[PDB]
């Protein structure tokens, strides 16, 4: 699922309002958005990164995706 807006991720209000500021609107950014850079962002800890990765894993996706052109 690389064709959905991030708001369709069923993300909680905290994660949605955080990731909205980083101009991250499609999963294609997030699948290669590195774990470290995701952790550096304001208001995003390990226990929320866990749920982000869990929602990704439910729909096949995950972080750490070497990828292709746009």
């Amino acid at each position: 699922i690389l064709l959905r807006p991030v708001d369709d991720l069923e993300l909680t209000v905290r994660s949605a309002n955080c990731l909205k500021a980083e101009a991250i609107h499609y999963i294609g950014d997030l699948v290669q958005r590195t774990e470290v850079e995701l952790l550096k962002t304001p208001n995003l800890g390990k226990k929320s990164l866990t749920e982000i990765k869990d929602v990704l894993a439910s729909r096949g996706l995950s972080l750490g995706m070497r990828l292709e052109n746009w």
């Binding site: 209000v13 949605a16 309002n17 909205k20 500021a21």
Partner: protein, 112 residues
């Protein structure tokens, strides 16, 4: 230095240089120190001071507190609540909620 000191009802004093808020147990004698606000309490206080005496609309308050944030209005309400709590304003006179027009801060005088 451009020093600005704000006098609030119940002889409250807010010193901008030291960023300190204290009760005056005399006309202007500092001995009863309420303390130092955080970096949004001070920001919202600055917003309400810069728009005095006009009420400040909530959208600009949010855009100044959160320049690049999709922050819900609940955080606005509770930020105002906590700022009024730490200023001991249980009677809602210090930071008044202008009905359907935003917020004002009750300030008597400015000392430079």
């Amino acid at each position: 230095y451009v020093r600005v000191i704000y006098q609030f009802p119940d002889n409250l004093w807010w010193n901008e240089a030291s960023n300190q808020v204290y009760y005056a147990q005399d006309p202007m004698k500092p001995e009863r120190l309420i303390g130092t606000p955080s970096i949004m309490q001070a920001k919202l206080l600055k917003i309400l001071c810069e728009y005095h005496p006009s009420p400040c609309p909530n959208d600009q308050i949010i855009k100044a507190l959160w320049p690049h944030g999709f922050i819900s209005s609940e955080s606005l309400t509770q930020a105002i609540k906590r700022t009024r709590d730490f200023l001991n304003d249980e009677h809602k006179t210090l930071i008044e909620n202008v009905k359907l027009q935003g917020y004002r801060i009750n300030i008597i005088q400015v000392i430079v």
